[model samples]
Target: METFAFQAEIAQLMSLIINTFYSNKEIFLRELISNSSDALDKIRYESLTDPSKLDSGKELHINLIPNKQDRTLTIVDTGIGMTKADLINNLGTIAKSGTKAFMEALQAGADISMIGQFGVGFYSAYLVAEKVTVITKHNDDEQYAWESSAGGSFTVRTDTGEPMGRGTKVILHLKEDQTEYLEERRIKEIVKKHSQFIGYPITLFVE
Candidate 1:
C-alpha cells in the first residue's frame, strides 16, 4: 500500500467543507450518485464505438447497501472504474477536476450536461461518515482500494478481494450522528428528491 498526504492547505479546506460547507448533509448521496451516473455515461459512450469496452453481462446500475449493525453504507455502481493513478490524481490531489474539462469541451458543441466540476463532491461523504473506502476496477487496469479518514492523508493499494469487473464501490462508515443514512426510508426519500431522474436505477438494500 502506498500512502500519500493531501496538500496541507487543501486538507484544511476539506475539513471545513465536510464540517460546515453544505447545509444539507444528505446531499452527499446526491453528489456521489451523480458521479456514478457520469461514470456509467462515459462507459456507455465508449461502448458505442467499441462494444468490448464494457464487461460481458454488465448493466449500468447503482446499488446502495446499508448495514445498521456495522453502521456502514455502501454504494456500488457498474460504471467506468479507475486505476491507482486515477485514484491518486483525482482523490489525493485537489483542484484537479476532469469534469471541468468535459464541461469546457461541451461549450465546443459536445453533448453533455453540466455536472459537478470541483472534484470535491466525493469528499462530501465525510460529512456523515468517519471514513470512506473506494474499491474500483477499470477495464484497463487491476483492481485497487483507496481509503481515507477525511484527514491529511489517504492510502491506495492492490485489492485481493472479489473483483468488481468494471465499476466502483464507495463504502461510508457512518458517524454516530449520521445513522439516519442507514435507514431505507431515509435513503429512498433522498434519492427521490435528488436523483429520481438519473438515467440508471438506484436500488436500495437494508442489510
Candidate 2:
C-alpha cells in the first residue's frame, strides 16, 4: 500500500468546497453515483467498437451496499475501471484547479450543473464522509485501491481482496454526525430525487 500526498492546490480545493457546501450535502451521493454512471457509459460506448470489453462483465449496473455495522456506504459499478496511472491522475492530483471555474460559475448563478464539468463533483464526498476509498480494476491493469480522508494526503495501494473483475467501488466512511445517510429510506429518497433517470440501473442492498 504505497501512500502519497495530495498536491497543495487540490488539498486546499477540497477544504474550500467542503466548507462552501454547508447545505445540500446529500448531493455527495449523487456525485458518486454520477461518476459511476459516467464510467458505465464509457465502457458501453467503447464496447460498441471492441466487443471483447464486455466479456469480463456483461451486465452494466451500479450496486449500493450499505453496511450498517461498518457505518459505510459502498457504491459499486460494473463499468470501465481505472488503472494505476488513472487512479493517480484522476484521484491523486489535478493539473488545473477547478475551484476557480466552479466558484465563478456559481457566482454567475449557473447552479451546480457545471461542477461535474470541472471534476470537482467528486470532492463533494467530504461533505458527509470523513474518508473515502476506491477499489478499481481496468481491463489492462490489475486492481488497485485509492483512499483518502479529505486531508493533505491519500494512498494508492494494490488490493489483495477478492478481485472485482472490472469497474470501481467507492466506499464512503460516514461522519459521526452524518449517519442519516446510512438510512435505507434516505438513500432511496436521494437516489429518486437526483438519479432517477440516469442511464444505468442502480440497486441498493439491504438485509
Candidate 3:
C-alpha cells in the first residue's frame, strides 16, 4: 500500500479537474465500473505468480445496485481492493493528479486522451452524490471503509463485518439534484456511452 498527497498548490488545480473538467457527469458509473475491470485484470495477472489467490471463479464481474429507499447506489466487484494507504492514495491524490498527467500527456505527445485511468475516476461520483462511501476488502489484508464528500477531504476507518472476500463496493448517496441517475433509462444510456467497450460485464438495477 502506497500513499500520495496533493501538493499544496495542486489542491486548487485538482478541484478544477474534478469539478469543472469532467463535463459528462453520468460517466461516473462508467469510470468506476471500468476501474473494477482493471482490478480484476490485476488479480488475473497476479494469478500467474500465486494461483491460490484467485478465488472469484466465474464471479469475476461487476454489479450495480440502486436503492431508492436509501437514496443510494452501490457498484461492486470481486476485484482488488485498496488497503489503508491505498484508500488515501487511490482516492486522494493519484487518481486526481493523473488528470494533470493527462493534460501533460496531451501536450507532450499524440492524443492518448481516451486511454482509461482511475486516478480521477472517483471524483466523478461527486457529480451525483452528496456523499460517498467506499467499503473494500483486499485479498492480502483486512477490510476497510472510506468516506468522502469530494470537498478536499475524506475519512478512512476499519470495516468490521462478515468481510467481503476481495473487492470494492462504492456506495453513493445521491443528491436531490442528481436523482435522475436512478432512472433506468438514464443509467443505461450512461453505461453504454462510456463503458460499452470496457471489456467486462456491467449489470445495473435501477429500480
Candidate 4:
C-alpha cells in the first residue's frame, strides 16, 4: 500500500471543479460514462492491430450498479484499466513535473494549452460521494484499488477481491444528502438524458 498527497495544483483543480458544479451534480454520471466509452474505444482500437491484448470473454460495456442497501453506486466498464503507477500519476497529480509551472501560468493568465489534458471527469464523483473507490486491472499490470475522498491525499493497494479481467469499476459512496443517486430510475433517467448516445452499451443494475 502507498499513500501520497495530491499535487498543489491538482488539489486546487479538484476543489475548483467540485465547487463550480455544485448545482449541476448530475453531470458526474455523464462524465464517468463518457470516460468509460472512451476507454472501451481505445482498447478496441488497440485490439484491432494487437489481437493479443484483447480478452475473450469480457465484452466491452459499462455496468451501473446501484446498491441502495450499501448506499453505494458502482460503475463498471470492461476496458483498459490502470497500473499502480498509472493510478498514482493520473490521480495524485495533475501534470507530471509541470504542475508548478502550470499553476504559475494559470495565475498569470498565460496562454496555457495543456490545461484539461488530464481529464477532470473522475473528480466529478466527489460532488456526490464522500469517498470514491476505483478497482482497475490492466493487461500489463496487476489489479489494484485507488481510493480517496477528493481530499489532500489518496491510497493505493493491491486488490484482493474478485478479478475484474481488464477494466475498471468505480464505486461512489454517496453522501447523506446525495442519496438520490441510489435510485434506479434516477440513474436511468440521467443516463438516458446525457449518455444515451454513448458508443458502448450501458446497463443499469438495481438491487
Best by TM-score: 2
Predicted candidate 3 versus true structure: per-residue lDDT over 1-207, tens digit per residue: 222344543355445544654455766777788789888888777877888777744357788888888888889888877888787654556755666776565457623223245255665676678788889887767798887665555677788755788888999999887777777888788788778886667888656
Q: Estimate each model's TM-score.
A: 0.86, 0.91, 0.79, 0.85
Which runs of model 3 end up more than 4 angstroms from their true locations? 1-14, 17-23, 56-58, 89-93, 102-118
Q: What would the per-residue lDDT of candidate 4 be over residues 1-207, giving only the tens digit for each residue? A: 788788777677656555643466887888788879888998888898988788533589999999978899999999888888789776445443344555566577743223333365676687788899999998989999999887788899999999878999999999899999988889988998988899888999877
Candidate 3: give the clashing pairs.
Answer: 95-119, 95-120
Candidate 2 scores a C-alpha RMSD against the true structure in Å of: 2.0
Quote the positional error of residue 69 for candidate 2 in Å.
0.9
- Pairs of residues clashing in candidate 2: none
Error in Å for residue 182 of model 2: 0.9
Q: Which digits, one per residue and each the tens of the lDDT, describe model 1 over residues 38-92? A: 9999888899999999753369999999998899999999898897778888554
Q: Best to worst by TM-score, what's the order? A: 2, 1, 4, 3
Off by over 4 Å in 2: 90-95, 106-114
Q: After superposition, how far is residue 30 of candidate 1 from its true place, in Å?
A: 0.3
- lDDT comparing candidate 4 with the true structure: 0.79
Cα-based lDDT for every prediction: 0.80, 0.84, 0.71, 0.79
Best by lDDT: 2
